[PDB]
Design a protein around this ligand. Sequence first.
Ligand SMILES: C[C@H](CCCC(C)(C)O)[C@H]1CC[C@@H]2C(/C=C/C3=C[C@@H](O)[C@H](CCCO)[C@H](O)C3)=CCC[C@@]21C
Length: 255
Amino acid sequence: DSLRPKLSEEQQRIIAILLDAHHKTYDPTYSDFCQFRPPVRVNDGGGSVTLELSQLSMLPHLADLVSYSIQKVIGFAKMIPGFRDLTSEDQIVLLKSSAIEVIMLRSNESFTMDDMSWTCGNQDYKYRVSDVTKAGHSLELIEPLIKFQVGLKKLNLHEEEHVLLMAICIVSPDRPGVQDAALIEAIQDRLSNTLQTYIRCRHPPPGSHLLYAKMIQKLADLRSLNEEHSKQYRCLSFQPECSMKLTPLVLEVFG
Ligand SMILES: C[C@H](CCCC(C)(C)O)[C@H]1CC[C@@H]2C(/C=C/C3=C[C@@H](O)[C@H](CCCO)[C@H](O)C3)=CCC[C@@]21C
């Protein structure tokens, strides 16, 4: 063929709602960042696990940034068509297991290939590999995280595809501990069908009909980064007085 059905009225509403949800929960001016505990950058040119763990100089700032981001994700998820139809128990399972992956996805909007930084930013609010090691993380997370960001940037997603990919990430029927996997799968399928149809209808050439499979592959990549973050957060958590440098929400979500 191959067939290019038009977006239904419902799929059109779904996309409008997700776009609106993202515009209300993602500030592209980063104007709240001055409210976070300030960034501190110690002398660590090369760049010492002992010193990084001793000082955790960027952790209060980046933990506030991540906590703030988790709050925005909860807000976004609440607006996903169908999410509120789930049990409060399943909503929380989905939120806590996807939070770090959605933060990695939504952070792509501040990421720039100009210098491979998340520029929120300023100079104070520009985050590089070395800022992330100053928060207690190691290259086994950071280097594939940068690779992931570049790979995602190069998909050149429409904002519609970006918000759908975040929604699909969150409403995933295979997360540990979900009860109503069938309901979650139904909601995800509706979103996935919307995304597939959108790409067919609206995405030039085509056939860049590998775009959907490239997007699904990013979801698998995110599971990997999630396991590695979990390992590294555990070792950060062993640092005496680390909990003062985090926040209640971060402690709960990642504990
Ligand atoms: C693995 C890290 C998170 C976990 C850190 C922790 C200390 C909790 O383990 C990194 C993931 C990316 C993260 C990062 C920027 C993330 C952003 C996400 C968005 O929510 C922000 C939107 C703000 C408006 O709503 C903005 O795009 C920046 C920079 C430098 C590495 C990290 C701190």
